[PDB]
Design a protein around this ligand. Sequence first.
Ligand code: ATP
Ligand code: ATP
Ligand code: ATP
Ligand code: ATP
Ligand code: MG
Ligand code: MG
Ligand code: MG
Ligand code: MG
Lengths: 501, 500
Amino acid sequence: EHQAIAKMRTMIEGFDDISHGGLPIGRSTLVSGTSGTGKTLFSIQFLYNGIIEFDEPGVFVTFEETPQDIIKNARSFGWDLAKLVDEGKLFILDASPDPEGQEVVGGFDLSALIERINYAIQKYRARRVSIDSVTSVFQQYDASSVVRRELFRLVARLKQIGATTVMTTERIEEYGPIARYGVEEFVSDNVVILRNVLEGERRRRTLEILKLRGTSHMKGEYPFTITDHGINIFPLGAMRLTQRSSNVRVSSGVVRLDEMCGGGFFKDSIILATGATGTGKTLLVSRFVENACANKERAILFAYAESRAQLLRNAYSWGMDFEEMERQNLLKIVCAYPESAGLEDHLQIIKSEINDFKPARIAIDSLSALARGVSNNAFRQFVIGVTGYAKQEEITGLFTNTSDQFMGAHSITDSHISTITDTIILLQYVEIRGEMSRAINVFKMRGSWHDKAIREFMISDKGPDIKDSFRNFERIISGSPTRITVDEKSELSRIVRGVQE
Amino acid sequence: EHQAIAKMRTMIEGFDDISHGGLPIGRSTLVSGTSGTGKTLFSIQFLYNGIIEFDEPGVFVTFEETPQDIIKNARSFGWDLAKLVDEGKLFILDASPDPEGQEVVGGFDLSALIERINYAIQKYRARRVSIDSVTSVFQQYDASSVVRRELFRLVARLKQIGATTVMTTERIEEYGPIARYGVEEFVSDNVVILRNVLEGERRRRTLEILKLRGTSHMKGEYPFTITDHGINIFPLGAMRLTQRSSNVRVSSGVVRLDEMCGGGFFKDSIILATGATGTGKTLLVSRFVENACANKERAILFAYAESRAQLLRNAYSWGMDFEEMERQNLLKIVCAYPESAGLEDHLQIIKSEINDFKPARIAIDSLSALARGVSNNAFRQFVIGVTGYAKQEEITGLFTNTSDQFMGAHSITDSHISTITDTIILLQYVEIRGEMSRAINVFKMRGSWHDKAIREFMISDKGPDIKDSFRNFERIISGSPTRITVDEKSELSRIVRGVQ
Ligand SMILES: Nc1ncnc2c1ncn2[C@@H]1O[C@H](COP(=O)(O)OP(=O)(O)OP(=O)(O)O)[C@@H](O)[C@H]1O
Ligand SMILES: Nc1ncnc2c1ncn2[C@@H]1O[C@H](COP(=O)(O)OP(=O)(O)OP(=O)(O)O)[C@@H](O)[C@H]1O
Ligand SMILES: Nc1ncnc2c1ncn2[C@@H]1O[C@H](COP(=O)(O)OP(=O)(O)OP(=O)(O)O)[C@@H](O)[C@H]1O
Ligand SMILES: Nc1ncnc2c1ncn2[C@@H]1O[C@H](COP(=O)(O)OP(=O)(O)OP(=O)(O)O)[C@@H](O)[C@H]1O
Ligand SMILES: [Mg+2]
Ligand SMILES: [Mg+2]
Ligand SMILES: [Mg+2]
Ligand SMILES: [Mg+2]
């Protein structure tokens, strides 16, 4: 064919993007990785999606696990492969060693295997093939050079059958040799790397497509997650910056804050609320979610510092109630420690809830808690992920960032997120006459006017009460101001033009 | 020969400069690299160029990939190698093992292959040869020393025919040994090393010519990009300081700013708009991109933070419509996440997007949104790439850098780019009477006078409005100034009022 390589859609969430179409049809694809990375799953989900979506028959070849365990373990994702075997759509070819014993099973055992596969293909008329762990076979007497020739024989014979094949290899070091015998990478037309990279004490699942002979593909490690729906990769780079926008205004919950912003927040905009600890970020978040519920809209709250009851207690002390909003089903709370997962996991925990409850407002309280030790690079990618998702879903997102230094915030966000967010709200402490006092301040708005005043504000049983500025103070930002006005008034005066010592 | 070493051009974009003419005539060149680097592509593109550009026939010796597979692979880049093998200009030598099961195939398999290769040379009068993956033949039972002889016999034989050859070798570690058996490097007269360096979940593709026995070459790594057009190398050293300069002026979109610059921006100059987030920038950028269309010039806005629609939402809220000038084919937005590629790729996208549309003005919103995750050096040389290209191709370019710390920042650019640009526009925050007012300063203009005052300005539905400076103040640059009393200054009168 004069056409370039065509790809077959794996229908695995994300992989079709990173691979730019799927898998090169007619060729084999090497899915290599350390233990427990999701190799076996990738091969099964590939075959499974082949039957469900495109009615393409499949053949699975196992060398270690028993077909019973394959069907058993695949029930974790809700895949009745057994039925797919019954319907003649799926065929599991058992090639795992019988527990007894037989000498020399690497000679004509492979050449017979290839013809076993060919029969399995011809009989079931299968388009997709998965061969889990081709490593176990060569783990008998063979070494290096033996593997390369024998592996090439299987890749070659498979290609002539026209099978879109997916093979599997094991590893020892995360960033060491791509495959065991340091040879499989060069024989295979396609190479895919599954990593369970440590870093700290958490684990980050990454997928990389090393090479696709004949086509294009996204380069680098893209994070993924194994869930009850299977492999889920987030192409945080294929995300097209075409997110819609609107001049429709929504309320922050605080009336004056709507006026300080030139008619309330925008619907299609991300809101950041910085400031030291204790200023009142959680409160602005509370009042924010309160608005959507009152307008018969759905809204979610993600807390990463407070308990579920301490989030209701302090809220009830502000008069507002989340109970009734939960009772009438318009408000949803999550609450989870940042250490309970990695950033790759949390992103999906959010994203999943967004599809189920389908809110109109998102309030992630404390992004600063998701930078706890996590690299500044792995963080930005996550932030952009949430922001870049809530934007294309048209959801007003209010975020929160506790500044690590009270009184003297030389920079807005210490993790340099300030560029991504549209609307910025700055809260700060102002030492007035030996007293700490709040000072709400709208700092940026990308479509509206916006007030430019550094207004003080009190909080009580009602909370956010916005008063007047500090027109008689220098160096407000510093936190330790200075009274001016060297003039007086009222009645007077005389003249007596003289000194007068 | 009594003369110097003649080099045959490879026509690989960028490689000829690095190799100072191309590959040495009648000699071998080792192109080593790990999986997915670009070895096979380099060798194919080497032969394919000689046929189309120089009418120099080529023989491609394969060891693993079947011929008919290699044919379909080159079709990725729109290359009909099936046509070239049919025209007797290219020949794919199939030395791949049979898909059956023989072992007594080679008792003289080296001298046998050489006679085959040498037969194909004189048969097609080939001047260029590419031996793809010579490693995949020693993977029978050979050791390290055994390779040194079987290579040296093949290398010497091809040198006796007088053919310029490219031998491909594979490897595991990126910076460890150069070839598999740690032998191939010294056998070949020429050593090219391809890499796919990772460094933090990304992949930078770099070429390096380790050695060229005989002549000189550019020393070190150089970033390259495998695209639809094949290999594209950026030789940032081959770009010498020879870009024309002019004195013709252009407008920033803000007429008042043009006065502050003493007549407006220079045409062949790089302008930078540094300022904390929320100052101007995108407003300044927008106004700058508008001036082209009214002057009927083409402009390109590379956005790296906001969507294509949000820009329109903000532009239409400052007057200026982007729709019309896009319909007029005078304006082009781009929009792409910084993590949607590599610095090497963004440079090529920009370079290509310039050629296709041919703009007179360029606006790259937020360079600071490109240093995200990247090292300083990889970023610094990227800036020199886009800056130098806008200079040599003679284009006015406005850039943007968001300083991390608002009010108190004592460095213009955090990544220290200052010395590269020709004009630095500075925006900042000034706390006046418990409020957040803006200010615009023209920090430098390399060839003009420019106003040296820190004027404040407003942002409205009609745009910016540069006003009066902060004369009755001090410590402006620190964000939180001083009211200077003031002063006094006591409403005139004879003796005042009291003292008392
Ligand atoms: N419902 C699920 N939720 C979360 N994780 C799951 C679920 N089902 C399976 N997994 C994960 O899958 C992993 C096992 O990977 P899989 O069986 O896909 O191939 P593998 O174990 O990497 O390859 P091999 O079987 O050759 O070692 C387990 O570590 C487990 O954490
Ligand atoms: N009923 C109330 N009356 C007066 N002030 C209150 C009341 N409830 C809370 N506050 C004030 O709110 C401040 C805490 O702010 P908020 O409850 O919004 O969480 P937060 O400051 O964002 O929490 P953290 O900084 O720990 O993340 C406290 O310093 C307290 O003075
Ligand atoms: N149209 C295309 N656009 C972008 N990239 C492409 C395109 N076609 C091929 N590539 C890239 O070329 C790479 C393949 O490299 P190449 O074909 O040079 O062989 P190699 O991997 O260097 O050799 P070996 O497979 O023997 O290790 C793939 O990783 C792919 O990313
Ligand atoms: N319609 C408007 N009326 C008044 N002021 C506006 C209007 N639109 C925007 N602004 C002002 O412009 C500022 C934002 O600047 P702009 O959107 O031009 O780019 P920027 O904020 O420098 O970009 P970045 O967010 O990347 O720093 C806001 O602080 C706001 O004060
Ligand atoms: Mg397995
Ligand atoms: Mg809080
Ligand atoms: Mg190769
Ligand atoms: Mg901007």
